[PDB]
């Protein structure tokens, strides 16, 4: 495991890297798909009689 991956033995202590996520979301950015959903409602409300 030392040659392939990390887990490198130092002073009697291994070291595993952090494999978590750090994504800084804002989520008002997908506001186009929301307006897309609002329009396709009133599309489907109207347009067929």
């Amino acid at each position: 495991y030392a040659k392939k991956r990390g887990w490198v033995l130092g002073p009697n202590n291994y070291y595993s890297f952090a494999s978590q996520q750090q994504k800084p979301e804002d989520t008002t950015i997908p506001s186009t798909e929301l307006a897309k959903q609002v329009i396709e409602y009133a599309r489907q409300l109207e347009m067929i009689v």
Binding site: S31, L34, A35, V38, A42
Partner: protein, 154 residues
């Protein structure tokens, strides 16, 4: 608005309104009971009036009367907006309970005659989806205008 035109009193042996090659005279007005009592048709006659519509007048009258630039993107701030979405739910609920009351009732002795002699024109679908349509369209217009300004303004 109506205009009129006097006929002479010498044409007493001939029928008045000497129409010859026209068939539009049955249109544009027929002589009502309040018109043919005073002088029609024995004194004067009626005349047709159309409207001289053209370009350089019509679109510029509409674009200055029924037109708003800054108003089409306002937000009608939500103190009274979500307040308006509350007084309508209660009366719709009572109509729904009244709609509940008739649907569970279901008179099934001579139904088609009882339905036609007892109409109300407010219970089944008159007061049921009218306000529901109005509350649906308003928040859609309001939220879509709210979403667009968030797309535009940063």
């Amino acid at each position: 608005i109506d205009a009129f035109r006097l006929i002479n009193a010498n044409m007493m042996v001939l029928g008045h309104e000497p129409r010859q090659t026209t068939s539009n005279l049955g249109h544009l007005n027929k002589p009502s009971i309040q018109a043919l009592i005073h002088g029609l048709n024995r004194h004067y006659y009626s005349i047709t009036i159309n409207y001289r519509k053209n370009e350089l007048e019509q679109k510029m009258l509409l674009n200055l009367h029924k037109k708003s630039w800054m108003e089409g993107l306002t937000l009608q701030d939500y103190s009274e907006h979500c307040k308006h979405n509350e007084s309508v739910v209660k009366e719709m609920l009572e109509l729904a309970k009244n709609y509940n009351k008739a649907v569970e009732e279901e008179d099934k002795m001579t139904p088609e005659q009882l339905a036609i002699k007892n109409v109300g024109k407010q219970d089944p679908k008159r007061h049921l989806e009218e306000h529901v349509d109005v509350l649906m369209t308003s928040n859609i217009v309001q939220c879509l205008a709210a979403m667009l300004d968030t797309v535009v303004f940063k």
